[PDB]
Amino acid sequence: TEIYTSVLSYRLLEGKAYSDADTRSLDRMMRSIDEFFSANPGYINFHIYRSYRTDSDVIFWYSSRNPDLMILAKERVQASMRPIAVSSFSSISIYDESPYNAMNKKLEDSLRLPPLRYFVAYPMSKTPDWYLLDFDTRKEIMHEHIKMALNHPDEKGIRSYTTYSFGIGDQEFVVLYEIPDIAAWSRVTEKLREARARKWIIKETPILLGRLVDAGDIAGFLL
Amino acid sequence: TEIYTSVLSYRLLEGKAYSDADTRSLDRMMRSIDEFFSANPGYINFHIYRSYRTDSDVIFWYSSRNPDLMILAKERVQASMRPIAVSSFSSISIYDKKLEDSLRLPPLRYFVAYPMSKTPDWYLLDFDTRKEIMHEHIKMALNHPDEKGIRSYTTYSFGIGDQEFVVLYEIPDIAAWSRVTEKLREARARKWIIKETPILLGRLVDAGDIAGFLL
Amino acid sequence: TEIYTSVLSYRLLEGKAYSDADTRSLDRMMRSIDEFFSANPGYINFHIYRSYRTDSDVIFWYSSRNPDLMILAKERVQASMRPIAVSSFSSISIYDESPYNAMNKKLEDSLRLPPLRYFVAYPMSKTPDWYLLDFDTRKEIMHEHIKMALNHPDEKGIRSYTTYSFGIGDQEFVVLYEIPDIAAWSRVTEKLREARARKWIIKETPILLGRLVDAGDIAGFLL
Amino acid sequence: MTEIYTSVLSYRLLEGKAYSDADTRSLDRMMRSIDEFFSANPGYINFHIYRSYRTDSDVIFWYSSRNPDLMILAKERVQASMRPIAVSSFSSISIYDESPYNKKLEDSLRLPPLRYFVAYPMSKTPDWYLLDFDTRKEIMHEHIKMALNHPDEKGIRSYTTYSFGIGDQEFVVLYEIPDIAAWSRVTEKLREARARKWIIKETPILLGRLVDAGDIAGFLL
Amino acid sequence: TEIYTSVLSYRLLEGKAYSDADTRSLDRMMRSIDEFFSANPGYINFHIYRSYRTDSDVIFWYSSRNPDLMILAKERVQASMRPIAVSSFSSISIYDESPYNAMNKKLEDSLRLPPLRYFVAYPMSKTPDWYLLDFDTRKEIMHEHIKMGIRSYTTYSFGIGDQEFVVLYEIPDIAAWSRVTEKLREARARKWIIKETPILLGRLVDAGDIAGFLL
């Protein structure tokens, strides 16, 4: 029943000049990755992003209820990327659907919508003291944050996903956002620095910022 | 009487395309490592895992009472892997239904390894106090509806590695284990626990199947 | 409305002697990058710097209102550098225009002034406690800081830009400075260690220090 | 009677190349040649080679001399021999604290080495040095007594060395040990000493298995 | 009239067997770097050092009042080193001439003295809390430390590097120096001192001799 997700980033190896043949080879490879995901109904979503950071050229995001499909997908992407690139980040985590369920929405339905132009992903953790607080006081601290986010004008049109990775990765959470406007998102985040929740929040690096790209267009953008 | 254990992870080197002959060579090499371990009953266990993390392609886990076998194993695996791969992690530690019998059971589908340490203040607490704290934590785990079927081994590495403990888990269900872990954040024991890196998550694989998965 | 900015740094790969041909190639490539930025009026500024740090050989700094131009610029620079170099830093952030508005002046005008000889950039963040202080408390603390800078004997000629990157990079701010004199700036910074503001400031690494260079002159300096 | 310096260096064979039998013979010749280099100069008090339990090293070297010129010459020789095939994963230079032996520490260094070796850097918090000398003395005496009284301390040879101002750590502590698990149990017990409150930065911990120069190529390749 | 200084360290690339041709080439290149510095009186000093640390083979130290000569020197060294080596550290900082001015001496005169056998450099910073102490309190604490052969240089790099200070020493004896540093751990000043890494320790070498030592 639970939905797993991964975010992977890769950087093309330096020290090599790329021929036209190399460009075409990259294009065929990205199209093939895209076809791998489209061919299996078990993949709920798969999107590719160009990267604003120089430590990555491409970011991949995909989701499935099947943990076997999750490892197969990682190996597929890795096998395709390794002759020309190295991974700069990976995460595996599980969507928390409760914010969607609370609003009579299905998280999966959101994942099936055509993606927004930008994507933000980062790991996040909280200090040990956070979990040692009463469920009630944590609820209050979190309500303030949620209320504050909901009330921001620049919040309009953002799709937010909280995912958990306790016991299975180097962070407790991986938080994912589909966003229409980089500056607007930054302003929302800046306002949310005003929430008490911040006092317990740590380790939000790397923050990945991506620009949606079709598989057939990426080689042309990169090379 | 002590039983040692090691977890090693490796990443295949980038920048090279693998031919069909390279794929066969990898298959032979992986099967050769597997048979290295099976040929010596001194190795209580040996398992290979596919890696969820992109910083590794394979994880190895093996155990022996014989510290000589532990260094021979590390050298064997490294000698086999170095032409095509680099290690991304290693640990050597000592384990804390006999544990040996448990290690001989058929392995579960998933595996988690991670280093961990505790704050200096922890060890300065009374043994009875620490025992009580550790028992609440065990009890909290045992009572969680998602804990069913998880096997855990706490191993120690004081003075012999870069963490104080390496805790190893065989788990049937990744999401279930993550939920148990989340609940355990509420245990008193967590106050003194220093998360260390990396947390490794693996999918059990037969040596004969790994070249097909990787390449 | 918002103006975006990026600072990128690259290190030439080691282990190869550069021929005369390789020198010509680097000169041509740098000239071509520069023509890329000059040809598009959508790029408000673009400057190249030689690097005092050994972990870089070149620093690029450019600005645009257009985030599409920003991702295209990053991809263009990365595609040009990757056969011979690896990136050692990148940032994407948004100018804060209010300090300029407070002195009745436009930030864009300033970005159009002839560049000064030296350049400093670094990331910076603040402790969670900072954002939880009242808005008027932060104004008082920041006033002390800004005034202390303005009255320093060594402050002459310095142009500073505070840029923000909440939710879009690994730091909260990227602070950029054009300076006429390195030691003068260092003395100003040393005095500002006495400002109350320092209590809440963290993570000022890496600090990049650059010497202004024209695209057609850098090959000569690097090789 | 002047100070005795020591260095621990570790190296990892470069990945991405298959080693031929000729490569194996070359490594054997090189290791034997390094061992001869240390043996030929009586200024080197000891020199031992260790196989490494960690994957980030294949070999660990330990050597000592009163002559700091011989120390840098040793590091340069080892690096020159290793660099065509390996990268260094750790190095240290430090000076033995002879007070616990004061027996002669040099006599201990000249004994045949034990089967295992542990080395690691260590530092203390700034606050430690600011404590009254009596308080530091009382804390160190507690630690030493707790170590002396542990059954598993049997037959371990310990060396504390200092590197204030000359390296990235304050101390490099070195142990010759007969048994890995016994050492780990001693170390575990010693977490109960108050000394621990001020100790930081004990990474990497290097754990080695003694090896003859003529046997290492066979073990590694 | 400030004086800038840089410390650069480099490590020869591994994976290459150096021929005799390569040794001669290294020798020519080192002598050529030395000739570059000697030929320009704008450089107040320039010295090369062998390194105790395996992460460096060579350390360079030079000084100039002219910041455009400083970037020229770094690029010159980097251009020569690039085909065979990678830099493991660099700093750029400015001498604090006040201790020399307090004793009515000139820092520059001291930089022109024949160098001592050993060189120590490391970055250092202080906690924020330090600078916010009353000017009075700071001067008192510093007087205990200052009061508590060796040639010392404090250099500052506020706002221009990853550390606040780079402290440089020419020393005649390593062990004696380690003992001085241990004693100074007792100075009140240490409360607020952080981040002294890497500590580089160098042995003075002539340009003409370095190739023979390294290869």
mmCIF file of C-alpha atoms in Angstrom, chain D residues 13-215:
data_model
loop_
_atom_site.group_PDB
_atom_site.id
_atom_site.type_symbol
_atom_site.label_atom_id
_atom_site.label_comp_id
_atom_site.label_asym_id
_atom_site.label_seq_id
_atom_site.Cartn_x
_atom_site.Cartn_y
_atom_site.Cartn_z
ATOM 1 C CA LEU D 13 46.387 0.429 -4.181
ATOM 2 C CA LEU D 14 44.797 2.328 -7.094
ATOM 3 C CA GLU D 15 41.601 0.863 -8.540
ATOM 4 C CA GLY D 16 40.743 0.321 -12.215
ATOM 5 C CA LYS D 17 43.715 -1.782 -13.227
ATOM 6 C CA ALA D 18 44.110 -5.546 -13.314
ATOM 7 C CA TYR D 19 47.419 -6.694 -11.858
ATOM 8 C CA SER D 20 49.455 -9.128 -13.927
ATOM 9 C CA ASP D 21 51.843 -11.646 -12.370
ATOM 10 C CA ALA D 22 54.628 -9.188 -13.375
ATOM 11 C CA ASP D 23 52.791 -6.462 -11.430
ATOM 12 C CA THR D 24 52.701 -8.846 -8.417
ATOM 13 C CA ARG D 25 56.437 -9.520 -8.654
ATOM 14 C CA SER D 26 57.093 -5.768 -8.953
ATOM 15 C CA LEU D 27 55.099 -5.083 -5.770
ATOM 16 C CA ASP D 28 57.006 -7.848 -3.942
ATOM 17 C CA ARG D 29 60.355 -6.380 -5.063
ATOM 18 C CA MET D 30 59.230 -2.866 -4.034
ATOM 19 C CA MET D 31 58.080 -3.971 -0.556
ATOM 20 C CA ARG D 32 61.277 -5.935 0.034
ATOM 21 C CA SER D 33 63.272 -2.881 -1.088
ATOM 22 C CA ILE D 34 61.389 -0.630 1.392
ATOM 23 C CA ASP D 35 62.049 -3.107 4.209
ATOM 24 C CA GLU D 36 65.771 -3.177 3.272
ATOM 25 C CA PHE D 37 65.845 0.638 3.279
ATOM 26 C CA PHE D 38 64.624 0.670 6.942
ATOM 27 C CA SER D 39 66.883 -2.225 8.019
ATOM 28 C CA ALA D 40 70.046 -0.743 6.507
ATOM 29 C CA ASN D 41 69.928 2.453 8.596
ATOM 30 C CA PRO D 42 70.417 1.854 12.359
ATOM 31 C CA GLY D 43 68.851 5.304 12.906
ATOM 32 C CA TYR D 44 65.476 3.647 12.333
ATOM 33 C CA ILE D 45 64.544 2.148 15.721
ATOM 34 C CA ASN D 46 61.667 0.125 14.292
ATOM 35 C CA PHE D 47 59.776 -0.417 11.039
ATOM 36 C CA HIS D 48 56.771 -2.701 10.679
ATOM 37 C CA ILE D 49 54.272 -3.335 7.884
ATOM 38 C CA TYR D 50 50.604 -4.235 8.499
ATOM 39 C CA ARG D 51 47.749 -5.584 6.403
ATOM 40 C CA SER D 52 44.661 -3.410 6.838
ATOM 41 C CA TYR D 53 41.182 -4.410 8.035
ATOM 42 C CA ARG D 54 39.719 -1.223 6.474
ATOM 43 C CA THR D 55 39.019 -1.150 2.716
ATOM 44 C CA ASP D 56 40.337 2.415 2.486
ATOM 45 C CA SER D 57 43.846 1.038 3.004
ATOM 46 C CA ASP D 58 45.757 -1.989 1.782
ATOM 47 C CA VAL D 59 48.914 -1.485 3.830
ATOM 48 C CA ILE D 60 49.965 0.423 6.941
ATOM 49 C CA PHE D 61 53.577 1.348 7.799
ATOM 50 C CA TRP D 62 54.910 2.306 11.223
ATOM 51 C CA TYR D 63 58.473 3.502 11.926
ATOM 52 C CA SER D 64 60.416 5.460 14.524
ATOM 53 C CA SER D 65 63.711 7.437 14.840
ATOM 54 C CA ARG D 66 65.322 10.084 17.053
ATOM 55 C CA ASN D 67 66.418 11.823 13.857
ATOM 56 C CA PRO D 68 63.741 14.077 12.290
ATOM 57 C CA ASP D 69 65.820 14.204 9.048
ATOM 58 C CA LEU D 70 65.479 10.399 8.828
ATOM 59 C CA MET D 71 61.727 10.826 9.362
ATOM 60 C CA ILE D 72 61.147 13.041 6.382
ATOM 61 C CA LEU D 73 63.526 10.931 4.264
ATOM 62 C CA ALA D 74 61.486 7.867 5.227
ATOM 63 C CA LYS D 75 58.156 9.459 4.282
ATOM 64 C CA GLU D 76 59.629 10.607 0.921
ATOM 65 C CA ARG D 77 61.029 7.169 0.153
ATOM 66 C CA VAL D 78 57.755 5.395 0.999
ATOM 67 C CA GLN D 79 55.701 7.943 -1.007
ATOM 68 C CA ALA D 80 58.084 7.704 -4.015
ATOM 69 C CA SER D 81 57.821 3.898 -4.042
ATOM 70 C CA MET D 82 54.027 3.884 -3.523
ATOM 71 C CA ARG D 83 52.840 6.767 -5.717
ATOM 72 C CA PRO D 84 53.040 4.938 -9.120
ATOM 73 C CA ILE D 85 50.541 2.353 -7.808
ATOM 74 C CA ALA D 86 48.805 3.774 -4.723
ATOM 75 C CA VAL D 87 47.512 6.816 -2.855
ATOM 76 C CA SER D 88 48.087 7.646 0.790
ATOM 77 C CA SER D 89 45.008 7.448 2.989
ATOM 78 C CA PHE D 90 46.576 8.744 6.247
ATOM 79 C CA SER D 91 49.841 10.051 7.645
ATOM 80 C CA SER D 92 51.055 11.330 10.976
ATOM 81 C CA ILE D 93 54.271 12.583 12.602
ATOM 82 C CA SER D 94 54.432 12.751 16.412
ATOM 83 C CA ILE D 95 56.767 12.295 19.406
ATOM 84 C CA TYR D 96 56.611 9.488 22.004
ATOM 85 C CA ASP D 97 55.628 10.309 25.570
ATOM 86 C CA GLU D 98 58.201 8.182 27.500
ATOM 87 C CA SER D 99 56.826 8.852 31.011
ATOM 88 C CA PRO D 100 54.702 5.589 31.376
ATOM 89 C CA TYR D 101 57.713 3.370 30.520
ATOM 90 C CA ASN D 102 60.054 5.473 32.645
ATOM 91 C CA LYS D 103 61.612 0.476 31.616
ATOM 92 C CA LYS D 104 62.826 2.133 28.408
ATOM 93 C CA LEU D 105 60.320 2.887 25.647
ATOM 94 C CA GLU D 106 63.043 2.266 23.049
ATOM 95 C CA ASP D 107 63.473 -1.279 24.470
ATOM 96 C CA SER D 108 59.753 -1.907 23.927
ATOM 97 C CA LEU D 109 60.041 -0.655 20.279
ATOM 98 C CA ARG D 110 62.872 -3.128 19.705
ATOM 99 C CA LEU D 111 60.828 -6.140 20.844
ATOM 100 C CA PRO D 112 59.357 -8.395 18.142
ATOM 101 C CA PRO D 113 56.019 -6.851 17.259
ATOM 102 C CA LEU D 114 52.716 -8.389 18.302
ATOM 103 C CA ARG D 115 50.162 -9.726 15.832
ATOM 104 C CA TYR D 116 47.907 -6.653 15.636
ATOM 105 C CA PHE D 117 48.308 -2.906 15.607
ATOM 106 C CA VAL D 118 45.879 -0.094 16.322
ATOM 107 C CA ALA D 119 46.617 3.556 15.617
ATOM 108 C CA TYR D 120 44.449 6.630 15.688
ATOM 109 C CA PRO D 121 44.628 10.361 16.134
ATOM 110 C CA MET D 122 43.020 11.899 19.219
ATOM 111 C CA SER D 123 42.453 15.424 20.553
ATOM 112 C CA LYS D 124 40.915 17.010 23.630
ATOM 113 C CA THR D 125 38.508 19.929 24.010
ATOM 114 C CA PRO D 126 40.041 23.388 24.706
ATOM 115 C CA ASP D 127 38.457 23.237 28.188
ATOM 116 C CA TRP D 128 40.559 20.238 29.232
ATOM 117 C CA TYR D 129 43.862 22.165 29.196
ATOM 118 C CA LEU D 130 42.251 24.997 31.116
ATOM 119 C CA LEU D 131 41.429 22.697 34.078
ATOM 120 C CA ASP D 132 43.741 22.809 37.135
ATOM 121 C CA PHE D 133 46.697 20.436 36.805
ATOM 122 C CA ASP D 134 45.529 18.510 39.888
ATOM 123 C CA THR D 135 42.099 17.866 38.317
ATOM 124 C CA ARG D 136 43.631 16.640 35.038
ATOM 125 C CA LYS D 137 46.029 14.448 37.002
ATOM 126 C CA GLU D 138 43.151 12.940 39.047
ATOM 127 C CA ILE D 139 41.163 12.216 35.848
ATOM 128 C CA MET D 140 44.109 10.622 34.050
ATOM 129 C CA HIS D 141 44.967 8.529 37.090
ATOM 130 C CA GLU D 142 41.373 7.178 37.145
ATOM 131 C CA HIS D 143 41.647 6.206 33.474
ATOM 132 C CA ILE D 144 45.040 4.509 33.918
ATOM 133 C CA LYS D 145 43.881 2.564 37.002
ATOM 134 C CA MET D 146 40.739 1.371 35.205
ATOM 135 C CA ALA D 147 42.879 0.155 32.273
ATOM 136 C CA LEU D 148 45.412 -1.563 34.606
ATOM 137 C CA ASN D 149 42.595 -3.457 36.343
ATOM 138 C CA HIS D 150 40.835 -4.819 33.263
ATOM 139 C CA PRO D 151 41.517 -8.559 32.731
ATOM 140 C CA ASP D 152 41.850 -8.090 28.936
ATOM 141 C CA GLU D 153 44.609 -5.435 29.244
ATOM 142 C CA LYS D 154 47.017 -8.385 29.412
ATOM 143 C CA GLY D 155 49.973 -8.112 27.047
ATOM 144 C CA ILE D 156 48.951 -4.940 25.213
ATOM 145 C CA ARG D 157 51.818 -2.485 24.523
ATOM 146 C CA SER D 158 50.583 1.097 24.521
ATOM 147 C CA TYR D 159 52.303 4.203 23.244
ATOM 148 C CA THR D 160 50.997 7.734 23.676
ATOM 149 C CA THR D 161 52.524 10.228 21.269
ATOM 150 C CA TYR D 162 52.056 13.981 20.933
ATOM 151 C CA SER D 163 51.841 16.241 17.926
ATOM 152 C CA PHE D 164 50.751 19.654 19.276
ATOM 153 C CA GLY D 165 51.538 22.258 16.655
ATOM 154 C CA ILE D 166 52.913 19.803 14.085
ATOM 155 C CA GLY D 167 49.831 17.959 12.793
ATOM 156 C CA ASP D 168 46.029 17.861 12.624
ATOM 157 C CA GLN D 169 45.690 16.101 15.960
ATOM 158 C CA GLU D 170 47.032 16.591 19.446
ATOM 159 C CA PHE D 171 47.957 12.928 20.063
ATOM 160 C CA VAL D 172 48.462 9.759 18.067
ATOM 161 C CA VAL D 173 47.941 6.717 20.266
ATOM 162 C CA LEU D 174 49.475 3.433 19.151
ATOM 163 C CA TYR D 175 48.884 -0.121 20.448
ATOM 164 C CA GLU D 176 50.433 -3.479 19.776
ATOM 165 C CA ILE D 177 47.741 -5.985 20.678
ATOM 166 C CA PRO D 178 47.541 -9.776 20.774
ATOM 167 C CA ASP D 179 43.728 -9.949 20.333
ATOM 168 C CA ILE D 180 41.261 -7.647 18.575
ATOM 169 C CA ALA D 181 38.140 -8.473 20.599
ATOM 170 C CA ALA D 182 40.043 -8.285 23.945
ATOM 171 C CA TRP D 183 41.285 -4.799 22.984
ATOM 172 C CA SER D 184 37.741 -3.789 21.978
ATOM 173 C CA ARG D 185 36.439 -4.928 25.409
ATOM 174 C CA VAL D 186 39.151 -2.927 27.228
ATOM 175 C CA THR D 187 38.243 0.114 25.159
ATOM 176 C CA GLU D 188 34.530 -0.385 25.921
ATOM 177 C CA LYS D 189 35.171 -0.492 29.678
ATOM 178 C CA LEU D 190 37.262 2.668 29.411
ATOM 179 C CA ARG D 191 34.205 4.580 28.128
ATOM 180 C CA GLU D 192 33.281 4.654 31.855
ATOM 181 C CA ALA D 193 36.253 6.876 32.699
ATOM 182 C CA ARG D 194 35.623 10.620 33.186
ATOM 183 C CA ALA D 195 38.521 11.304 30.765
ATOM 184 C CA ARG D 196 36.046 10.588 27.962
ATOM 185 C CA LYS D 197 34.156 13.843 28.577
ATOM 186 C CA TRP D 198 36.965 15.845 26.981
ATOM 187 C CA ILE D 199 38.139 13.414 24.259
ATOM 188 C CA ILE D 200 37.252 14.041 20.607
ATOM 189 C CA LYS D 201 38.248 13.182 17.010
ATOM 190 C CA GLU D 202 39.368 9.531 17.216
ATOM 191 C CA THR D 203 39.088 8.868 13.452
ATOM 192 C CA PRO D 204 40.327 7.174 11.473
ATOM 193 C CA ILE D 205 41.022 4.187 13.685
ATOM 194 C CA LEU D 206 43.553 2.010 11.799
ATOM 195 C CA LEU D 207 43.551 -1.726 12.595
ATOM 196 C CA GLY D 208 46.339 -3.850 11.158
ATOM 197 C CA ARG D 209 47.639 -7.408 11.044
ATOM 198 C CA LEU D 210 51.453 -7.748 11.138
ATOM 199 C CA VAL D 211 53.016 -8.882 7.873
ATOM 200 C CA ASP D 212 56.490 -9.632 6.552
ATOM 201 C CA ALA D 213 57.548 -7.485 3.544
ATOM 202 C CA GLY D 214 58.079 -10.653 1.459
ATOM 203 C CA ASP D 215 54.518 -11.924 2.107
#
